[PDB]
Design a protein around this ligand. Structure first.
Ligand SMILES: *[C@@H]1O[C@H](CO)[C@@H](O[C@@H]2O[C@H](CO)[C@@H](O[C@@H]3O[C@H](CO)[C@@H](O)[C@H](O)[C@@H]3O)[C@H](O)[C@H]2NC(C)=O)[C@H](O)[C@H]1NC(C)=O
Ligand SMILES: *[C@@H]1O[C@H](CO)[C@@H](O[C@@H]2O[C@H](CO)[C@@H](O)[C@H](O)[C@H]2NC(C)=O)[C@H](O)[C@H]1NC(C)=O
Ligand SMILES: *[C@@H]1O[C@H](CO)[C@@H](O[C@@H]2O[C@H](CO)[C@@H](O)[C@H](O)[C@H]2NC(C)=O)[C@H](O)[C@H]1NC(C)=O
Ligand SMILES: *[C@@H]1O[C@H](CO)[C@@H](O[C@@H]2O[C@H](CO)[C@@H](O)[C@H](O)[C@H]2NC(C)=O)[C@H](O)[C@H]1NC(C)=O
Ligand SMILES: *[C@@H]1O[C@H](CO)[C@@H](O[C@@H]2O[C@H](CO)[C@@H](O)[C@H](O)[C@H]2NC(C)=O)[C@H](O)[C@H]1NC(C)=O
Ligand SMILES: *[C@@H]1O[C@H](CO)[C@@H](O[C@@H]2O[C@H](CO)[C@@H](O)[C@H](O)[C@H]2NC(C)=O)[C@H](O)[C@H]1NC(C)=O
Ligand SMILES: CO[C@]1(C(=O)O)C[C@H](O)[C@@H](NC(C)=O)[C@H]([C@H](O)[C@H](O)COC(C)=O)O1
Ligand SMILES: *[C@@H]1O[C@H](CO)[C@@H](O)[C@H](O)[C@H]1NC(C)=O
Ligand SMILES: *[C@@H]1O[C@H](CO)[C@@H](O)[C@H](O)[C@H]1NC(C)=O
Ligand SMILES: *[C@@H]1O[C@H](CO)[C@@H](O)[C@H](O)[C@H]1NC(C)=O
Ligand SMILES: *[C@@H]1O[C@H](CO)[C@@H](O)[C@H](O)[C@H]1NC(C)=O
Lengths: 337, 271
């Protein structure tokens, strides 16, 4: 009975196109994008994206339809199908210890969707500065294998795990193999035995090792893996074998990959990022109370042929001031009264 | 002095002599140059008596174009350069056509309209990129001394028209395309009942509809942002920036729509 037509003022952000990118992130290097000042549709997102599981928390399912928001953050990463039971609301296992942390306070939704593995790739970049500083390369993994971690540590801006050769030669016994430490950083705290024995991952007492067991938080990334101090040795070029504390897992399920996505909405019932699901529901004009481009009225519609419309003129008005026709901006179908 | 934010103070000086010229070209609206089409209406073989916002028939333009090479004076930002946006403005812009390596580039100034130019309020920015026009109505933080920087022949300064780490609360963002090899572009801007309406045209024809946005506030000041270029002068070429503007007022016009809808003859009720 009601035909609502109105051109949007803000463009579309294509959340589905960003979720279906050829470069799929990893549990460690989970990506995001601040979607704002756009319109999002739930039906198209659930249709195009192959939805497998969907839930929410601190908000109703029907509440998302129609409500406006200020910003949307989509924290996505490929599912490690091995550890799927770790993605629980309030978990502290292997997943939520060195990876993305689930939001509990604000309204947050969770989605688990499949994606074809054809011509797709998995990105496993390490978003750490002190890791890339001390000679970090890659992991040399195979296709369709995502990298995650459980233990996460941190160091200081002037901490050299690869000690200076002077400190190594000063301690005749219990000397750690290490090359020339670069400048601008203090050497490793160390016959003088050093700290963090036998490895920074597992220690007898955390007070004797300057690398403290750090955890993740809301939007916080792991500062880096547990790089072994006495396993490098070039100006402290660390071998890729000295980077421990990580793990790799496949994502093959019915010959397809799986990706989890956490949606965080900021600005409940505010902002301009509104959902056009409640208004744009029928979108089918039958040959009727209409609200077209702000003009409200009542009348019957018919299908005729017309070619006298420009690229900015949709409504047809007469010299008296009444509307007698219009053009649908979605199907180019001219409907006259 | 348009906004309130410290942006830069390296090249800041004063001046004593800048007159904004007054073109001898009177406003001729008999051929349809000076009017605008309706928002989204189509007419065929009719005479529409439209009571809208139009410039004064047979008036003069005030050139608010400002160019610069090394320095810019604070007097350029003070009145009367910041004219009182009472009802609206009709602007004629000279499409600066530069030739670099036998290819063409289109350049002209940008427009910023705001009440107090504070991020707690809404301001509209119209920026011409190469072949594109970007319109953004956002809560931009306007710089103290904004200026547009050349991107086709280089500029010593850097472009500074807003400072925002994240995207502010925008109400309208859109892009349009225009012909790059044009001579004079025309623009119409006005406000009514808290709604801002804009129109544009590439050639000497009535301006086409751009957008209409509801704000609820009252716009106070419009500004044509100056341009900083290195090779636009008297030593490298002989063409400059000519931005003419005329104030709008509420008046009644008569437009003639032909069989197709093209405006042929428009008349004003002021003899
Ligand atoms: C919205 O606009 C307001 C008004 O400009 C912004 O407040 C201004 O923010 C700047 C940058 O933080 C302040 O500059 C600083 O001033 C202090 C002295 O108070 C100085 O020591 C610093 O070196 C720096 O120059 C400025 O003072 C401040 N204005 C006022 C009146 O306090 C605000 O940041 C803008 N917000 C957004 C989100 O854009
Ligand atoms: C925007 O969201 C609405 C809300 O779901 C969509 O409307 C549904 O469309 C599907 C088919 O596209 C129908 O099967 C449903 O019955 C519609 N919902 C209702 C309540 O009628 C709409 O299609 C979406 N827009 C686009 C372009 O996909
Ligand atoms: C409705 O008609 C317009 C006008 O032809 C179509 O817009 C054109 O779309 C094609 C392909 O997407 C482009 O190559 C043209 O440049 C577009 N022209 C203009 C003027 O925008 C539009 O695609 C049509 N829509 C439907 C659903 O048929
Ligand atoms: C309107 O056009 C401008 C100019 O091309 C677009 O700005 C570009 O945006 C892309 C992607 O964000 C950047 O890679 C370019 O560097 C930008 N160019 C400039 C000159 O800033 C803008 O995105 C367009 N907006 C819309 C809604 O189409
Ligand atoms: C942009 O403007 C130029 C300048 O008028 C247009 O070039 C004209 O094109 C017509 C059509 O063939 C010719 O008859 C004129 O002789 C051309 N004039 C000049 C000075 O070259 C150009 O066509 C316009 N762009 C578009 C897309 O229409
Ligand atoms: C802009 O036009 C002026 C006027 O013709 C040019 O000035 C002349 O330049 C030629 C060549 O350098 C001299 O021989 C004349 O004596 C100049 N006349 C005057 C009155 O100064 C000027 O060169 C042109 N601009 C450019 C960049 O060529
Ligand atoms: C020829 O000089 C121009 C130019 O380079 O194109 C032209 C003109 O002299 C002037 N620009 C304006 C709008 O007045 C401008 C200023 O006179 C100078 O650039 C110096 O201006 C200041 C404020 O120092 O210089
Ligand atoms: C990659 O696979 C997807 C899923 O089948 C498909 O949509 C896309 O077109 C493919 N890309 C190429 C370049 O074949
Ligand atoms: C990666 O591992 C494969 C396994 O045999 C090996 O052939 C290849 O040389 C390795 N590449 C690097 C850069 O380590
Ligand atoms: C603006 O900031 C610059 C440094 O970026 C400073 O030199 C200048 O004094 C400031 N202007 C003020 C505070 O008016
Ligand atoms: C413009 O930005 C560049 C990039 O850092 C900088 O090197 C240059 O000094 C800036 N120019 C001015 C005039 O501030």
């Amino acid at each position: 009975a009601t035909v609502y037509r109105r051109i949007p003022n803000l463009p579309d952000c294509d959340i589905d196109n960003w979720l279906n990118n050829v470069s799929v992130p990893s549990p460690l290097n989970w990506e995001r994008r601040i979607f704002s000042n756009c319109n999002f549709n739930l039906s198209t997102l659930l249709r195009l994206v192959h939805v497998d599981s969907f839930s929410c928390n601190n908000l109703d399912k029907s509440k998302i339809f129609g409500s406006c928001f200020n910003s949307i953050t989509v924290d996505k990463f490929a599912i490690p199908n091995r550890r799927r039971d770790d993605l629980q609301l309030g978990s502290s296992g292997f997943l939520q210890s060195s990876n993305y942390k689930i939001d509990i306070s604000s309204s947050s939704c969770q989605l688990y969707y499949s994606l074809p593995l054809v011509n797709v790739t998995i990105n496993n970049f390490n978003p750490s500065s002190w890791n890339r500083r001390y000679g970090f390369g890659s992991f040399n993994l195979s296709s369709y294998d995502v990298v995650y971690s459980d233990h996460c540590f941190s160091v200081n801006s002037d901490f050299c795990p690869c000690a200076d050769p002077s400190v190594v030669n000063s301690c005749a016994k219990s000397k750690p193999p290490s090359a020339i430490c670069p400048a601008g950083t203090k050497y490793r705290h160390c016959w003088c035995r050093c700290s963090c024995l036998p490895d920074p991952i597992s220690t007898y007492s955390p007070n004797t090792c300057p690398q403290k067991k750090v955890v993740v938080g809301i939007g916080e990334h792991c500062p880096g893996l547990g790089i072994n101090e006495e396993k490098c040795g070039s100006s402290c070029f660390c071998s890729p074998d000295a980077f421990l504390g990580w793990s790799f897992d496949s994502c093959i399920s019915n010959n397809r990959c799986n990706i989890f996505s956490n949606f965080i909405f900021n600005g409940i019932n505010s902002g301009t990022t509104c959902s056009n699901d409640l208004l744009y529901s029928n979108t089918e004009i039958s040959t009727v109370n209409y609200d077209l481009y702000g003009i409200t009225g009542q009348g019957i519609f018919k299908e005729v042929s017309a070619a006298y419309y420009n690229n900015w003129q949709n409504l047809l008005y007469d010299s008296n001031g009444n509307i007698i026709g219009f053009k649908d901006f979605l199907t180019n179908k001219t409907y006259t009264i």
